[PDB]
Amino acid sequence: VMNLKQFSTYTQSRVDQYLEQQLSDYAPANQLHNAMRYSLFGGKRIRPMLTYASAQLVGDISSLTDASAAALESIHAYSLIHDDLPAMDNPTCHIQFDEATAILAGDALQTFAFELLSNPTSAQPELAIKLIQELVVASGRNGMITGQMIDLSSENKNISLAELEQMHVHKTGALIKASVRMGALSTGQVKPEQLAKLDAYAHAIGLAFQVQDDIIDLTNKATYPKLLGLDGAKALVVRLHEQAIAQISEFGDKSQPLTDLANYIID
Amino acid sequence: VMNLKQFSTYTQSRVDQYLEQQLSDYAPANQLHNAMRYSLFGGKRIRPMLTYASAQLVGDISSLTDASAAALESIHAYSLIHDDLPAMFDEATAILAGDALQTFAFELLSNPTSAQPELAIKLIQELVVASGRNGMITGQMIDLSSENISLAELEQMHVHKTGALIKASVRMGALSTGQVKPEQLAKLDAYAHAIGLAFQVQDDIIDLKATYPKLLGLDGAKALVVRLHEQAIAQISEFGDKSQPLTDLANYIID
Ligand SMILES: [Cl-]
């Protein structure tokens, strides 16, 4: 089994080459592709890493694992471009190009995610449809976008711990969960019990990194240290970390990447 | 048997009720859903109409025809929101609503049906090719990187920006029946190509920088439109009365 250094190198190289190959040349789209590529290519590929790690846990990395990892990275990349837009937050894609270009590159990166998952080379349509459903629920009104919406609508108010958790679970939690769920599903071998453990793993890790982030900033608006005290936020990170690892303990050596990734993502 | 007014009323109420029902309630998304619904509802619903009409040409309207018509309308609706942005509620909401309407189009197509998943994947592929880097978005990008171009360049822009979704509508409609044959798709492609071009020529004529009337004269351009409309009809007339909706739609898209 790969240690974290090797596993991150392997999966980053793997998803990067695959994205490059699938983003096929198309002359009318030259300008569009330039902007798309500028955004897809830095970043640490956390979501691809989780996807490949989960596939490895329960079976073997497959063509649909590549499609999932790449689709998830495309969704993530699109969300970052649209998030840097002046109307939201604020060299970014709209700085290097313009705002109009960044908007279209984001839109196209979303469509590319679905292109990745519906490639004709796949002969597993029922599984592809399932992965598409997974991505839809994580990325749209049931997930990521609703989280961004909540974040925007909450910027003047001070929200409760429950509201803060709800916001993060949608805004960043859902795609993290889609990563482990889709990875495992893409093997064609995952059992419902394994998927439930991965759910809980992902939930814990997703929240823990947001809590840890607020703790890091500490060294107006709602944060975990303000809601729980610095001590309470630190304890929560430790508890979530322990919970995440406990969910995958019974898998043995195959769980090492997910264990290593827990520490890395959290910090 | 149905006339256009009737077909329009039938399809618009049908796609609107399907959209409303499929956009299921979800409390955390309340604000987002408000924005989406505000965008999803006026409009002529040309793409749904083409989808249902194309399904009727070759077979029976099915639940996948509904998903298709609704998915196409959500793509079109998101594209209008993003098109209206200053760079081209409030601005941040509009961006998110557009993004969510795109995801909702894929929700619609991937929702459980009785149909084979192979067909659902095909429909998704058609929507992808029409909407993304291979179609609509590249059309919009070309339009941006253009503010003096030739007819050929203008044509290319329109074929992507507008033509691709029109073609997707007729292709997805027929495919969604589960009964389309390849030669029928080739005919629908030719129909879409003809009406799409006729629309652009007519769009140059109305208005009276490369244009069709500059090339051919006003009479020459008018003649070409009548010709393209006839070509579009010629692709579908062999289906008899089943071709009525697409026939009426051709008369109507060309104004
Ligand atoms: Cl299905």
XYZ file of C-alpha atoms and ligand atoms in Angstrom, chain A residues 126 129 133, chain B residues 109-117 120, ligand 1:
14
model
C -26.324 1.830 -14.723
C -26.121 6.961 -13.904
C -26.890 11.061 -9.319
C -31.993 13.327 -16.820
C -30.449 11.051 -14.201
C -33.586 10.559 -12.102
C -34.887 6.955 -11.964
C -36.983 5.811 -14.949
C -38.285 2.473 -16.262
C -36.112 3.012 -19.337
C -32.729 1.361 -19.963
C -29.826 3.263 -18.429
C -30.558 7.810 -20.202
Cl -32.267 4.780 -15.173
